[PDB]
Amino acid sequence: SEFLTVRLSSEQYSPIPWLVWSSSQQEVIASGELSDWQQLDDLKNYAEQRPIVVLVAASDVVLTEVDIPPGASRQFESMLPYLLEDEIAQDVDDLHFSVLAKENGKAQVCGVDRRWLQHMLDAFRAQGLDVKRVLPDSLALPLDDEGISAAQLGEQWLFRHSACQGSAVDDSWMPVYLNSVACFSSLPEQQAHWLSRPVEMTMALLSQGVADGKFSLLTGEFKP
Amino acid sequence: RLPFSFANRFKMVLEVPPVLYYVEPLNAQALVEVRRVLKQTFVPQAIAAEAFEKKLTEAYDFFSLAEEAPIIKLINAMLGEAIKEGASDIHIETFEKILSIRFRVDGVLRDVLSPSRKLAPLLVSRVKVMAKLDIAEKRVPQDGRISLAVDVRVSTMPSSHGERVVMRLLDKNATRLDLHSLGMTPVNHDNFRHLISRPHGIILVTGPTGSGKSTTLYAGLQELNSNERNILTVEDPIEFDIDGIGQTQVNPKVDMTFARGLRAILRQDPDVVMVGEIRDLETAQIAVQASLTGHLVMSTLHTNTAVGAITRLRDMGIEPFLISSSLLGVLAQRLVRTLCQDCKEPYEADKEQRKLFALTLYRAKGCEKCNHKGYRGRTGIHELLMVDDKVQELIHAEAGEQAMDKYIREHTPSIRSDGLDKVLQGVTSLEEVMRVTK
Ligand SMILES: Nc1ncnc2c1ncn2[C@@H]1O[C@H](COP(=O)(O)OP(=O)(O)NP(=O)(O)O)[C@@H](O)[C@H]1O
Ligand SMILES: [Mg+2]
Ligand SMILES: [Zn+2]
């Protein structure tokens, strides 16, 4: 009925937006923002007896598509790091991968730094907070039939390209990155066809998507 | 810096306000991947293929010696003593009756030695020759440089009693973290400088997530970073590479843990050891045995207070006797956002606010420079617990947190008190100190 959504990133100095959404009432019960990761103790009061969903920043996550080698669907996940080894900019052993979808001859993948994800879970565990789900913040945006769904959070633009594909980019180089966009916030002074949708609070909008979807990076080694 | 494999493939180079040079057509997927790895924003700049390839290739004892030429050794020892104490500037000044030398350590001047006045012209002559300056000329200012990885800038100037010399000591390493610039006070830095300089014992930097405990350890290791010491570390992961220090990374693919990595480090004949953190008893036991067998150990814990770190070692299973003999000190630390200097609004503190300390404090407000927060940047506030004779007794006897907090408040300032001093200076707000301090 009610759940706490928390938006985290790799930047420990950056703010941590949170929001208590109620699917029963369809309303925002509580809302705030931690300044640093030093305030993780403050989330105790807002969690109480409610599931915690962590929204990792899509900027701190690799969301990409890869071709499944013919007739190797059952062993695909073991071959996943090696197929993406050239396409990531660090050692692929460092990343933890989660298959979001398998359709036709392609698979939808989400990678994240293993040590960061483990460290985030250890930070919440030290505070007595039990994280139920972890997913990319961009994938919590709603799908639109007329274009790419977008929303501004802080000084970043979240983009959901499709069901499993997504991204988060800074305002400074957002226009260069895009080279139609259904926007659920105030339109920027940038960009390339921006369709204005009814404006909502981004964390409230994301929370509604969290209630709809089942995606979670807590898989394999990170399963509860 | 990106990996060469990635940069060569997608045609993207990073050269530092970080600039990201690229060749068209730009790949949106690869652009996001660069943002993920750096954990920082950048400025994309388009470049032609020919100019890109060139950018890619270019990218990838003083005191004892004073009582006894002999001048050459004295000046070299003085410079070694300056780097030891962490001096920024060396002042050699000649008066009528007295020759005096002074260091400025973290902004604060200090008397080091006042030798015989007769030596005055010889010290001026030696320092000039090292910097390729004119020995005979004494009527004009002369400026020179030396490389010793220390880059000293030296300036002479005429005075009424000869010439006055100043040597500005600067490290060429641009990634050097100055512990005072990070936020430590001159007294806290000296006490921490002395603690990490010891031959053996454990030092713990504690605080919650994002308290700057890794950054403080790194700055401490960089200060010790010398060829006379063998410094090694186990990390999970390695935050960034310090040149000269051997950094091992924790690897679960070969079952290389903190404990197993720490044992391997101890067979490498180290002087100083740094363990990322002590999560379990196994790693704690090894770190304690290292400290009792002639190794300086540095690590971290996620406790809210400096005294909580001692209680944490107690709770993990380390025997009180072993904690008292091993532990040198605990550095409790928090980060507080620094107020924007352009838009910070002054206000006089009320009676409830004055209890914590016309007392003028500063508020956040906000403007386009901070955009639009009121703060810009961060700085550290600290509480350095120093394990002395009486602290060793209290750990052995198991006096508890309550009785131990009593004695600790008599000698060492609190983390709030250090924070409140910065509020008086106008660096951070009272709201930010009270946020991170409970
Ligand atoms: N003294 C400081 N002044 C300004 N910025 C700082 C300072 N110390 C750390 N930072 C920045 O703040 C972030 C947090 O610092 P960090 O050293 O990672 O904290 P930490 O407590 O060691 N993290 P963790 O290991 O997760 O508990 C880093 O990204 C630094 O760049
Ligand atoms: Mg750390
Ligand atoms: Zn301002």
Side-chain angles (χ1 to χ4, degrees), chain A residues 1-103 105-124 126-189 192-224, chain B residues 2-14 17-49 51-53 55-59 61-64 66-67 69-350 352-353 356-370 372-400 403-405 407-410 412-437:
Chain A
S1 61
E2 301 175 9
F3 58 91
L4 175 58
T5 309
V6 191
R7 162 58 155 74
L8 298 170
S9 63
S10 60
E11 299 173 33
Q12 296 192 322
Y13 55 83
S14 292
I16 299 169
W18 64 266
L19 190 140
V20 179
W21 176 262
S22 183
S23 296
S24 60
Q25 299 185 36
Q26 298 287 308
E27 284 181 25
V28 178
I29 285 180
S31 185
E33 199 181 50
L34 312 181
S35 304
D36 301 322
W37 280 57
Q38 296 172 116
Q39 302 187 245
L40 285 173
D41 63 329
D42 297 357
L43 293 176
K44 291 184 192 189
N45 312 137
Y46 307 114
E48 170 86 15
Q49 201 244 198
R50 284 188 280 246
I52 298 172
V53 179
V54 174
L55 297 185
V56 64
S59 59
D60 303 315
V61 149
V62 62
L63 283 163
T64 186
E65 195 171 35
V66 294
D67 300 315
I68 305 176
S73 187
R74 171 263 209 77
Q75 300 82 1
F76 168 75
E77 198 161 328
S78 304
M79 304 165 71
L80 195 58
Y82 306 109
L83 286 163
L84 288 171
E85 192 172 348
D86 294 339
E87 300 184 350
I88 78 158
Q90 65 175 125
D91 195 349
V92 76
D93 293 325
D94 299 355
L95 279 62
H96 169 256
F97 293 97
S98 303
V99 174
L100 303 176
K102 281 186 184 177
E103 293 158 321
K106 291 177 179 184
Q108 304 299 331
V109 187
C110 185
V112 67
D113 187 285
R114 181 192 58 266
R115 296 182 179 89
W116 181 89
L117 181 59
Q118 182 63 238
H119 181 54
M120 186 276 297
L121 294 166
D122 292 344
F124 277 62
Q127 232 71 51
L129 300 174
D130 193 42
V131 177
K132 299 293 184 177
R133 285 171 66 191
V134 180
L135 64 91
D137 63 338
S138 296
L139 301 179
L141 291 168
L143 294 166
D144 199 346
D145 299 348
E146 298 177 13
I148 291 164
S149 56
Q152 181 165 18
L153 172 53
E155 295 84 1
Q156 285 186 358
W157 273 101
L158 311 195
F159 290 105
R160 189 177 182 184
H161 303 84
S162 72
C164 301
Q165 305 174 26
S167 184
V169 300
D170 302 316
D171 266 295
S172 54
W173 52 270
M174 188 271 294
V176 180
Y177 162 77
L178 280 161
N179 307 335
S180 64
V181 178
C183 187
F184 296 83
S185 62
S186 59
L187 300 172
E189 298 190 311
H193 291 270
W194 285 63
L195 308 174
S196 62
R197 296 282 178 273
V199 177
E200 296 184 50
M201 189 178 288
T202 305
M203 283 292 290
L205 180 58
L206 294 176
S207 296
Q208 288 174 239
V210 167
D212 296 328
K214 277 186 174 188
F215 292 129
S216 184
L217 308 185
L218 301 183
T219 57
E221 310 177 340
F222 287 102
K223 253 179 85 282
Chain B
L2 298 159
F4 176 76
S5 181
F6 190 89
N8 188 27
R9 192 183 308 282
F10 296 103
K11 306 296 183 179
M12 295 179 182
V13 179
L14 190 79
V19 187
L20 181 67
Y21 301 100
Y22 72 95
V23 184
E24 294 179 27
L26 181 65
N27 200 294
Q29 200 88 51
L31 186 64
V32 167
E33 183 57 33
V34 172
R35 175 62 179 88
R36 192 184 69 75
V37 166
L38 301 179
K39 311 162 184 175
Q40 271 190 344
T41 192
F42 48 71
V43 179
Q45 189 172 0
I47 266 184
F52 177 89
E53 295 294 339
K55 199 78 188 177
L56 181 63
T57 314
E58 185 185 9
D61 186 36
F62 167 73
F63 298 111
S64 297
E67 291 194 43
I71 300 301
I72 294 166
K73 285 186 72 185
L74 190 76
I75 297 302
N76 289 17
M78 185 181 70
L79 286 159
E81 186 62 37
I83 293 151
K84 167 92 153 294
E85 295 183 18
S88 56
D89 302 68
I90 301 176
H91 298 267
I92 312 173
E93 57 192 340
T94 311
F95 305 120
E96 195 196 318
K97 289 187 177 296
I98 301 164
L99 172 65
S100 184
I101 303 187
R102 292 192 292 183
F103 300 155
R104 188 186 295 276
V105 183
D106 306 341
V108 182
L109 281 98
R110 182 191 296 182
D111 289 10
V112 312
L113 185 65
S114 57
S116 180
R117 205 277 202 180
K118 299 182 298 192
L119 282 89
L122 301 175
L123 303 191
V124 173
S125 185
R126 168 57 191 171
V127 172
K128 276 170 167 187
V129 168
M130 293 168 65
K132 307 178 170 69
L133 303 177
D134 199 335
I135 304 156
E137 186 61 31
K138 315 187 195 181
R139 307 168 300 164
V140 302
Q142 312 186 47
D143 300 67
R145 311 189 317 175
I146 326 172
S147 293
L148 299 170
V150 192
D151 178 39
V152 326
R153 273 80 201 284
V154 48
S155 297
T156 60
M157 192 178 59
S159 183
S160 60
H161 305 108
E163 279 173 302
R164 225 191 97 101
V165 189
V166 171
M167 313 191 215
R168 184 177 64 178
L169 312 178
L170 293 172
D171 190 16
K172 290 203 76 178
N173 195 348
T175 327
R176 179 155 180 171
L177 295 162
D178 182 33
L179 211 39
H180 171 72
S181 301
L182 291 171
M184 280 200 182
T185 57
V187 175
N188 286 346
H189 192 188
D190 282 327
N191 289 334
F192 196 75
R193 188 190 270 105
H194 289 35
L195 213 61
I196 68 182
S197 185
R198 294 283 280 272
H200 55 81
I202 308 176
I203 297 165
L204 303 178
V205 181
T206 183
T209 309
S211 55
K213 67 174 83 183
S214 302
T215 306
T216 295
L217 287 176
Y218 272 56
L221 295 169
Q222 282 178 340
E223 196 171 21
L224 296 171
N225 190 17
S226 184
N227 54 21
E228 74 174 33
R229 293 199 197 78
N230 181 33
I231 304 163
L232 295 174
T233 177
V234 195
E235 306 191 46
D236 188 38
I238 297 171
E239 304 300 327
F240 96 90
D241 188 54
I242 309 169
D243 187 33
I245 292 166
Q247 302 166 250
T248 303
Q249 187 163 305
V250 167
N251 194 359
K253 303 303 188 194
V254 296
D255 205 1
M256 179 76 162
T257 62
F258 271 113
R260 192 164 169 257
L262 181 56
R263 285 196 201 87
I265 289 176
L266 290 162
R267 297 192 300 275
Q268 294 278 311
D269 182 35
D271 293 303
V272 184
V273 184
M274 198 277 279
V275 193
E277 55 177 318
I278 310 163
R279 301 186 196 181
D280 54 49
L281 180 57
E282 189 177 16
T283 314
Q285 287 169 349
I286 299 159
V288 171
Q289 288 297 328
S291 58
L292 300 177
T293 55
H295 307 94
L296 186 92
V297 189
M298 282 166 65
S299 197
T300 61
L301 292 171
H302 298 272
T303 66
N304 293 341
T305 60
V307 189
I310 296 164
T311 310
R312 174 55 185 166
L313 292 168
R314 255 266 302 282
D315 292 7
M316 282 198 296
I318 303 296
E319 292 214 327
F321 172 62
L322 301 177
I323 301 168
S324 59
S325 57
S326 62
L327 192 66
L328 293 171
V330 180
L331 181 76
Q333 185 175 329
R334 252 60 151 190
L335 295 180
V336 295
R337 298 196 290 165
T338 54
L339 287 159
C340 180
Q341 299 295 312
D342 301 335
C343 68
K344 57 171 182 177
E345 201 75 53
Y347 74 99
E348 291 178 21
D350 66 62
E352 190 184 349
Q353 293 186 241
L356 286 309
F357 304 91
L359 192 65
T360 189
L361 311 184
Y362 284 86
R363 216 192 285 96
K365 191 191 179 181
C367 74
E368 287 192 344
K369 297 266 188 167
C370 47
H372 225 105
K373 315 306 189 177
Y375 307 88
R376 199 169 77 183
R378 286 128 277 144
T379 188
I381 58 167
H382 307 91
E383 170 185 330
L384 183 53
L385 180 71
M386 212 103 77
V387 178
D388 71 322
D389 294 13
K390 295 183 187 279
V391 171
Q392 288 190 316
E393 289 183 49
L394 294 167
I395 295 164
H396 204 138
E398 297 178 310
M404 189 140 54
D405 187 37
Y407 176 76
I408 288 166
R409 286 283 148 267
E410 299 192 328
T412 175
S414 63
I415 192 168
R416 192 149 75 263
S417 62
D418 186 47
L420 289 174
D421 292 344
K422 299 204 174 203
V423 181
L424 297 174
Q425 291 165 27
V427 179
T428 187
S429 65
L430 182 66
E431 286 77 43
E432 213 74 289
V433 172
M434 295 295 296
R435 172 177 73 82
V436 306
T437 306

